[PDB]
Amino acid sequence: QKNPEFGMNLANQYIIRKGAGLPPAKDVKETYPECKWRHYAGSFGWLDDYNVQCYLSPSYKFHAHSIAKAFKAEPSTKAGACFDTANTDQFPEGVPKYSIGVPYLYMNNLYDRRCKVRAMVKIPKTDEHEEKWVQAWVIDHNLGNWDKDGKENDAYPKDGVLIDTNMYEQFFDKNKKVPDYSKTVPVEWFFLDINTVG
């Protein structure tokens, strides 16, 4: 099976060629200004200016900048929102090397769930490693309704993401690890195979 079916291998452009030869990346918030966290009919949700549900499609041209919490990947391969979705092309057996979970800002849970799809995630330079992009898999959905410090509230926007605990510790210098995962970390990422906004 040829993968990608058409065009350049984008993942290798980031992983082997460090993102060279690509346009300056904009922020995915710019693709849909009216996609806001709104109240309607007794719920909060991601709604546009006509109260139609919306969600964002971050791509290599429009990266997401999210506040992440850690999660333990292995349980989401046995339970959760994605584990019984049909396997997609090259989806790993076992636990993916890099795993994320995404909230309603980035999916529709009835018709566009984005379970078992690929995402590129940037791990910034630390004193242990150069900055690097990695190819991760979506293996669960999450709420993500926390503020910058991780405080959760039912009225807060559902926009935070989850990154697996091993990845998470790679965001910190040798002597700044967070063994109880109590700190949020900012994460820049996008969907590797979704490219629908110019």
Add this chain to the structure above:
Amino acid sequence: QKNPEFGMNLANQYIIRKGAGLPPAKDVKETYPECKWRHYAGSFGWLDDYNVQCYLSPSYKFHAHSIAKAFKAEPSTKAGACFDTANTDQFPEGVPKYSIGVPYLYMNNLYDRRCKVRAMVKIPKTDEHEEKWVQAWVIDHNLGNWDKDGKENDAYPKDGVLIDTNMYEQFFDKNKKVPDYSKTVPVEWFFLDINTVG
């Protein structure tokens, strides 16, 4: 199961209230000008200005304007690209009342196949009926590499769609049916639950 999970019932706004109150539609081509039919590594494909595969996400704000041919819906409930995709919420048993098939301009066949998703399709005024919007289901993929008159070529853009034979005959006046299905028809449509571009 609440459906849509958030926000207003968009299908009813078109089916019952004819689209009233909604913004005048634009054309989905404006959402991705650099998504073009290009040649790369021995194949034609929908590719952007960096040779990355792309596809369009027409919504109620950004309608697709396509050239359609007729197809027989029932065989695509038993074989084809979609019939064995997991059923989605409210997907009909048996043959949907209105069915379409879509090409690579509008999907990614590995990770965003848009099988068994909902689309709104406009059926134009004829001498038999008023203009009306109907809620259809995607039940197959198609090639769609024909020009505006239906002539097919391996190098032509894969952008035409399929509409079922019963919808097709509704595009024609009482005494102007096309029983050999040789005539294409222009169709305006969008994805009912995909709303990712402002």
